[PDB]
Curated annotation (Swiss-Prot):
Organism of provenance: Conus textile (Cloth-of-gold cone)
Disulfide bonds: C2-C8, C3-C16
Site (Important for binding with soluble acetylcholine receptor): R5, P7
Tissue: Expressed by the venom duct. Tx1a that containing 1 or 2 non-hydroxylated prolines are mostly present in part 5 of the venom duct (distal part near the pharynx), whereas tx1a-OO (with 2 hydroxyprolines) is mostly present in part 4 of the venom duct (follewed by part 3).
Highest taxon above the source species: Eukaryota
Span within the parent record: 40 to 55 of 56
Positions of region (Ser-Xaa-Pro motif, crucial for potent interaction with nAChR): 4-6
Residues with PTM Cysteine amide: C16
Positions of post-translational 4-hydroxyproline modification: P6, P7
Extra remark beyond the main annotation: Shows no inhibition on alpha-4-beta-2/CHRNA4-CHRNB2 and on alpha-1-beta-1-delta-epsilon/CHRNA1-CHRNB1-CHRND-CHRNE up to 10 uM. The toxin with a different disulfide pairing [C1-C4; C2-C3] shows an important loss of activity on L.stagnalis soluble acetylcholine receptor and a complete loss of activity on alpha-7/CHRNA7 nAChR, respectively.
Function: Alpha-conotoxins act on postsynaptic membranes, they bind to the nicotinic acetylcholine receptors (nAChR) and thus inhibit them. This toxin inhibits rat alpha-3-beta-2/CHRNA3-CHRNB2 (IC(50)=3.5 nM), rat alpha-7/CHRNA7 (IC(50)=392 nM) nAChR, and the L.stagnalis soluble acetylcholine receptor (all tested without hydroxyproline).
Name assigned to this protein: Alpha-conotoxin TxIA
């Protein structure tokens, strides 16, 4: 998925 916000702020491909 794609998170512009936490907790996807870490080194996770979901951080788009």
């Amino acid at each position: 998925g794609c998170c512009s916000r936490p907790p996807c702020i870490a080194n996770n491909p979901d951080l788009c």
